[PDB]
Amino acid sequence: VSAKPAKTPTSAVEQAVGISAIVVGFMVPAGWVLAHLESYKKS
Amino acid sequence: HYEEGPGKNLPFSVENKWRLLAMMTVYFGSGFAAPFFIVRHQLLKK
Amino acid sequence: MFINRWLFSTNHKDIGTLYLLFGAWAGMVGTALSILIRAELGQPGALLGDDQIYNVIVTAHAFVMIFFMVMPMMIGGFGNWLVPLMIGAPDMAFPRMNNMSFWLLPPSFLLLLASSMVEAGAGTGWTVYPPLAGNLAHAGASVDLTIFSLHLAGVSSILGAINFITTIINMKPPAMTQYQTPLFVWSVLITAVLLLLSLPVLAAGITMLLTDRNLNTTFFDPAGGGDPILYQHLFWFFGHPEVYILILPGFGIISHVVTYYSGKKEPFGYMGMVWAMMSIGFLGFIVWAHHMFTVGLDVDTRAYFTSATMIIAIPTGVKVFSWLATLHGGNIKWSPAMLWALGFIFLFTVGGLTGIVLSNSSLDIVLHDTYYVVAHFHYVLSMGAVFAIMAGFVHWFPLFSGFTLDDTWAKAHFAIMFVGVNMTFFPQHFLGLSGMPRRYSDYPDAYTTWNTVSSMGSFISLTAVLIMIFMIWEAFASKREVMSVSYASTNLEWLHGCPPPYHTFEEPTYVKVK
Amino acid sequence: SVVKSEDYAFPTYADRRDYPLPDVAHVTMLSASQKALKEKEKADWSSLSRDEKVQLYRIQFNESFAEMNRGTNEWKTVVGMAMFFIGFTALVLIWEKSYVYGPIPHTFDRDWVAMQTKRMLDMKANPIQGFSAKWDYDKNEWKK
Amino acid sequence: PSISNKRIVGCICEEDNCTVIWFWLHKGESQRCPNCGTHYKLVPHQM
Amino acid sequence: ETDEEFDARWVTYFNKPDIDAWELRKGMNTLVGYDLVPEPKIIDAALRACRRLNDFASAVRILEVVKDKAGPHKEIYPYVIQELRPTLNELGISTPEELGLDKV
Amino acid sequence: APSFHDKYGNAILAGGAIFCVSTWTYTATQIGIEWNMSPVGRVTPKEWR
Amino acid sequence: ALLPKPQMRGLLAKRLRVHIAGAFIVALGVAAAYKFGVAEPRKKAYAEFYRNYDSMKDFEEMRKAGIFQSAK
Amino acid sequence: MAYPFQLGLQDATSPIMEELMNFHDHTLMIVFLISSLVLYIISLMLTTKLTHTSTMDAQEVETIWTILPAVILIMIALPSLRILYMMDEINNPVLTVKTMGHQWYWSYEYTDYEDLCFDSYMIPTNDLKPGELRLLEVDNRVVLPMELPIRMLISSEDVLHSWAVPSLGLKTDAIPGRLNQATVTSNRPGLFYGQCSEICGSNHSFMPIVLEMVPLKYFENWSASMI
Ligand code: HEA
Ligand code: HEA
Ligand code: CUA
Ligand SMILES: [Cu+2]
Ligand SMILES: [Mg+2]
Ligand code: NA
Ligand SMILES: [Zn+2]
Numbered sequence A: 001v002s003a004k005p006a007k008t009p010t011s012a013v014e015q016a017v018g019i020s021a022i023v024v025g026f027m028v029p030a031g032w033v034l035a036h037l038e039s040y041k042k043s
Numbered sequence B: 001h002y003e004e005g006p007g008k009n010l011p012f013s014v015e016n017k018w019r020l021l022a023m024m025t026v027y028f029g030s031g032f033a034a035p036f037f038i039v040r041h042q043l044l045k046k
Numbered sequence C: 001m002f003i004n005r006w007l008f009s010t011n012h013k014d015i016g017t018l019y020l021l022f023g024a025w026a027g028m029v030g031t032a033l034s035i036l037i038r039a040e041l042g043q044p045g046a047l048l049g050d051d052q053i054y055n056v057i058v059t060a061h062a063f064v065m066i067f068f069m070v071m072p073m074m075i076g077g078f079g080n081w082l083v084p085l086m087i088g089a090p091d092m093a094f095p096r097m098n099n100m101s102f103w104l105l106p107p108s109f110l111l112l113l114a115s116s117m118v119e120a121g122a123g124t125g126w127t128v129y130p131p132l133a134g135n136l137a138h139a140g141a142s143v144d145l146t147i148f149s150l151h152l153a154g155v156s157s158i159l160g161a162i163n164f165i166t167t168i169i170n171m172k173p174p175a176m177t178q179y180q181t182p183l184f185v186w187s188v189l190i191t192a193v194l195l196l197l198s199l200p201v202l203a204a205g206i207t208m209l210l211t212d213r214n215l216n217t218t219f220f221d222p223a224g225g226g227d228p229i230l231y232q233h234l235f236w237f238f239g240h241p242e243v244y245i246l247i248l249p250g251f252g253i254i255s256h257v258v259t260y261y262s263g264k265k266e267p268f269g270y271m272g273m274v275w276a277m278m279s280i281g282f283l284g285f286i287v288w289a290h291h292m293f294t295v296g297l298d299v300d301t302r303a304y305f306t307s308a309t310m311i312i313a314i315p316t317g318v319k320v321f322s323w324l325a326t327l328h329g330g331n332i333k334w335s336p337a338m339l340w341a342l343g344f345i346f347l348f349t350v351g352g353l354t355g356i357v358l359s360n361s362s363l364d365i366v367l368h369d370t371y372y373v374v375a376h377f378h379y380v381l382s383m384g385a386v387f388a389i390m391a392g393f394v395h396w397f398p399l400f401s402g403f404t405l406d407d408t409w410a411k412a413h414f415a416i417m418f419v420g421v422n423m424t425f426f427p428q429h430f431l432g433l434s435g436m437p438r439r440y441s442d443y444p445d446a447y448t449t450w451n452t453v454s455s456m457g458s459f460i461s462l463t464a465v466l467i468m469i470f471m472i473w474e475a476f477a478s479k480r481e482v483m484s485v486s487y488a489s490t491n492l493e494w495l496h497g498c499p500p501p502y503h504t505f506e507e508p509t510y511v512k513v514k
Numbered sequence D: 001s002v003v004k005s006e007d008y009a010f011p012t013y014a015d016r017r018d019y020p021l022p023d024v025a026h027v028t029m030l031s032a033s034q035k036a037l038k039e040k041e042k043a044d045w046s047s048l049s050r051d052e053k054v055q056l057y058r059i060q061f062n063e064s065f066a067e068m069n070r071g072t073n074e075w076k077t078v079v080g081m082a083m084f085f086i087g088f089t090a091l092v093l094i095w096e097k098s099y100v101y102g103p104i105p106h107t108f109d110r111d112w113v114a115m116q117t118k119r120m121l122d123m124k125a126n127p128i129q130g131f132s133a134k135w136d137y138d139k140n141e142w143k144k
Numbered sequence E: 001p002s003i004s005n006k007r008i009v010g011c012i013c014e015e016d017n018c019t020v021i022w023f024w025l026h027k028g029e030s031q032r033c034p035n036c037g038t039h040y041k042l043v044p045h046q047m
Numbered sequence F: 001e002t003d004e005e006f007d008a009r010w011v012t013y014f015n016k017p018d019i020d021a022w023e024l025r026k027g028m029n030t031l032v033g034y035d036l037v038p039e040p041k042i043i044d045a046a047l048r049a050c051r052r053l054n055d056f057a058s059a060v061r062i063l064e065v066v067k068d069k070a071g072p073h074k075e076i077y078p079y080v081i082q083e084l085r086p087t088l089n090e091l092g093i094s095t096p097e098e099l100g101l102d103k104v
Numbered sequence G: 001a002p003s004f005h006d007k008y009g010n011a012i013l014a015g016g017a018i019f020c021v022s023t024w025t026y027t028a029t030q031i032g033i034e035w036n037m038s039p040v041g042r043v044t045p046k047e048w049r
Numbered sequence H: 001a002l003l004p005k006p007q008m009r010g011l012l013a014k015r016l017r018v019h020i021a022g023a024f025i026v027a028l029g030v031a032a033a034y035k036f037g038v039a040e041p042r043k044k045a046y047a048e049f050y051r052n053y054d055s056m057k058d059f060e061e062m063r064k065a066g067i068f069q070s071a072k
Numbered sequence I: 001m002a003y004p005f006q007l008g009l010q011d012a013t014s015p016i017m018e019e020l021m022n023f024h025d026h027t028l029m030i031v032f033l034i035s036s037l038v039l040y041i042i043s044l045m046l047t048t049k050l051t052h053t054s055t056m057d058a059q060e061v062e063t064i065w066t067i068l069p070a071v072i073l074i075m076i077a078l079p080s081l082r083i084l085y086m087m088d089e090i091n092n093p094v095l096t097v098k099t100m101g102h103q104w105y106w107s108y109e110y111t112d113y114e115d116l117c118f119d120s121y122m123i124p125t126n127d128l129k130p131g132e133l134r135l136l137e138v139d140n141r142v143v144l145p146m147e148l149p150i151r152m153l154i155s156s157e158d159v160l161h162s163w164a165v166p167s168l169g170l171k172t173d174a175i176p177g178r179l180n181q182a183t184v185t186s187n188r189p190g191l192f193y194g195q196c197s198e199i200c201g202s203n204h205s206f207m208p209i210v211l212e213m214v215p216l217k218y219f220e221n222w223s224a225s226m227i
Helices: A012-034 B017-045 C002-007 C012-040 C051-086 C095-117 C142-169 C183-214 C228-261 C270-286 C299-325 C336-359 C361-366 C371-401 C407-425 C427-434 C445-478 D032-040 D050-060 D074-100 D110-122 F003-013 F021-032 F040-052 F057-069 F077-088 G005-029 H011-051 H055-063 I015-044 I062-085 I216-226
Strands: E006-011 E021-026 I095-102 I105-110 I116-120 I142-145 I150-156 I161-165 I170-174 I180-184 I190-195 I208-214
Touching (some): C012 C051, C012 C445, C051 C228, C095 C142, C183 C270, C299 C361, C299 I015, C299 I062, C336 C361, C336 C371, C371 C427, C371 C445, F057 F077, H011 I015, I095 I170, I161 I208, I170 I180
Parallel strands (some): I142 I208
Antiparallel strands (some): E006 E021
16 A cells, blocks of 8 residues: 655654553543552552 | 545544544453453452 | 534544544553553552452453454444555545444443542453343442443444445445455455344343343342353354454554565465455354353363364464465565564464463363463564554554555654554563563562563553654654555555545446456 | 656566566656667667676666676575564563562472482383483492 | 546456456556457446 | 467568557456566567657667566576667667666 | 664563562562472471471 | 477466376375374384383382381 | 462373373364364365366265264264263262351261261361462361262252362262262372352352361271361
């Protein structure tokens, strides 16, 4: 499948911000609820 | 008539990269965070 | 404007798009559940405490990954997008029933989530065997909400199956036969046939389970006259057709991808593919009691059933060897979907061979409900069905969206996905052989080390799907278009451009016999 | 420039070794010197020098077969990103071992596993090949 | 026949052949099948 | 069928007096997909057919696909060129290694 | 023309290999994961009562 | 001198036949390697264990350390 | 019972698990063979520069293509059916023991003569004696004579359990209102460790089975002592 040159091409820094955004937005809630299970067990 | 073309056959606008990145991460993060909060709920029950 | 386009939609492409979105969300829900399971099994001890919440997570992982990730995406999404495009139809035959099937799906998901939220919890496994699923061990509303989730998903998929069979059989051009259609069309025809032939059996089974729970019947109560072996018979009479449903459109997708990216004009032995798919479909209906080799059946009955597993092993062997045979002398283009298809071939071969090891009832005495079974069904489901979903997604993301993915990120995603799943599910063979049973929240110390290794592999797969999301965003962060597609003459869905318009085939195809 | 919406109907210059003679010329519109080359083309090829040959072959086609089969080096950066992301996975697991996971059960320290191993060898647990068959029951040591 | 400027044409140009091959056919002269060369011509005037 | 009627049918098909571009391209595109390095009389007929309808660069990719359809072993292409040299210097067609199209 | 992969690919290969091996030997050796190794030839048996 | 005529027609088929011969030999080699490494040593280990086995002495060695709940 | 870094099965004590282990080695050698075929072919035939992308004879190899997996499946299935019929002989047992799987514990009835019955619960982790096993030690071990045919009738009071001992090659469903049969023999004395294999609630991981197999005279002394 042939591909056109990008209409709005991204650079390396914006892709780094994107991968960091996915990592932080996926690891804050699950990591927060996994960071203290014994608090939910009435510590 | 409805829009025809690339990026317009989708139920969400793709004309900006950053608001769509925020949209994807909140949608798929709500998906990833639902069962964790469920498990928090049955731990908080008893 | 939005409501009439999406909530009131009556064409197949929009419903396939909504399938892709909903199944991506539900798949990531299931991935979170799988990470939770492997987090309990990582180190010895109880991170969550009791086994009840762990069984709730296990059952939720099974239902969410079966009926809400592979099922809607694979069958509904790829069939609705491609089947009227492959056969040259303007739309489905009954588009309102297709829209109703989609909109019944998130009610079923909400009922499943509410089943998990109610304090009893549906911690029974995805087998909903009584008297564990009765009103004594699980006196509450979790099992009932689970039963109605299965009812809604079943009605959704019967409606979709009816719509698919009538739009394949009838909406062809009047010159083409059924043996001139593409292979994915054949796979979804046979899939829809077994769907409507198998789903009412579990519908009746869980209806009788519901009446046993709340209407004081004794269908499966041993103190009243019934027995749970009847429930096991009906459940697995649906259940092995269900996993053949889970694997057959994957066969169509990998056949299409291997045919395309090798440069071939057609798969080798099209009649062999068609015959083997109808043989697998006809022969998956009489193999169900290989799931009950330890219930105490007759020895002659299990002899018949293991012979039935051998004769169902032969035609998929014909399919995988012909998949090998259509790689002969082809211009092998090293696309990412090619890597997904070759990983499909190898890992699905390994999973099927472990299933053949399990198929002997003599060794199924030893290996029943151990982790050897878990390795078998994950090497078929979580590798074959997932790799076929990814192969179809990578191959048809130019068609669905209009933009092309970054192939370098796609090859990296395949690499870490392959490493993660192979490190997750290879020590489970050793844990099953050593003798750790299924559904265990804590194990003895001798099962520790492989469990530790297995837990690490799950996180790698998390990284895989994490960067997968970035891949999708990168396409919409690039907006690189498609001038052209190679081999557009053989494949009909690529002939209207990327993406195709709302109204296609108003002027239909011109094909003649005489 | 931007071409109209019939980019799918008309055939395109497809560049692969499976299709050696494409149906579309790569350079559609031609300059005046290229029309002079095409006018000269009707005569014999003996009066054609090197530069006219290579420029008309570049007019009709994009790449030779040596250019399209070249070994570029993307597999190294694909597996390099792979080992990046597996390393980030490993540091995520360092965090999860540090904070999420609690203490190990008490049956894993050295005295308990020593008495455990003595009970393994004492009860002769699986002594044909696996564990108690790797121990000397006369010298009271492991098998060498 | 057609009502537009082009139509998708599917050729089964030998019998007992599985894969139909599809090609766009426009106005003007007779285009050919892209493997067999049977001539197809478009006359767009029907209703 | 066997060798000689294959060779005779292809050399008569490429020596069509009213040859045009579409069917020469279709003959080459069907010939390349065969499990067969083409016999040098067929390639001779194809080169003269390219000369008949006044096309140069198609003949250069004809020579290129004879070069790279042989595959790994390299005893085919110098043999085909060493048999086709009277054709190669009777039409003015230039060989791909001398045109600089094999230096990547 | 020098493409992206030509020297950056060697750089990413070297960096990925060294980063992965360093972080995995840290997470397998240093963070106190009890691997539950095979006790053959390694433990001495202690007399339980 | 000049070059002879090599095989022009179909080396894919002859490559397939020589490598399908190699495929059968190497696959039988893998199967025989696993068998002669694992399966037959296991069978002869079982034969060596059970051919000269006394169980009264084995039970006496187990019961001399106080493991059974029935023999004190 | 299991040891760390174990790859294969637990080794055999009953004759049945010796034949099961030999058949497992046979079928895993077959799986290794055909996986070597698939892997070597897929590694071979993507690694060439020769091409053949034209019409090919669709049906000229299917007879061998169909009879080789059929004959290998027959070669698998014949010893499978042999050992499948090797578990349903005339038993003529010596002892009959009845197990009932109560709600997360086991109960044992030796009631051929002088009716004896007891309960098996796990010794908790905090109350383990030194040297014992976590999650695998019971209050009352289940004492049987060795190298004898012993009938073992398995059921449960309320829900589905699975009475399983892997090293003796036994795994039988404990179904309420239904009495399944197994036979158990041995060749060595000692302690054999199994646990439940069917989902049975919130302590499903927490019911083990300990089979202590002793000589006949010590089994008689134990039976006289426990009553
Ligand atoms: C993708 C879904 C899928 C597919 C295709 C299969 C395919 C098969 N499955 Fe499985 N199975 C499941 C999903 C699937 N299964 C699930 C989800 C369960 C769990 C249910 C539960 O909870 O209990 C399960 C459980 C399950 C069990 C239960 C084990 C137990 O309860 O103890 C058994 C028993 O043997 C079994 C057998 C088989 C067999 C024999 C095949 C065959 O169809 C495989 C054949 C496929 C091949 C790829 C082999 C062909 C390849 C060749 C190269 C030819 C081989 C030729 C020779 C060896 C001569 N399956
Ligand atoms: C579709 C079926 C499916 C899939 C994919 C998986 C995937 C996984 N499963 Fe699952 N599993 C089951 C079906 C599945 N499983 C079933 C049916 C059971 C039996 C339950 C029971 O005991 O009753 C089970 C049981 C089961 C257990 C048993 C727990 C126990 O009994 O103690 C465990 C733990 O190791 C486990 C782990 C995993 C892991 C680590 C993955 C990983 O592979 C997770 C990674 C998967 C993905 C990341 C999905 C891929 C999706 C995408 C890449 C996104 C797609 C989106 C787009 C393309 C837009 N599974
Ligand atoms: Cu009883 Cu699990
Ligand atoms: Cu099954
Ligand atoms: Mg069971
Ligand atoms: Na745990
Ligand atoms: Zn034709």
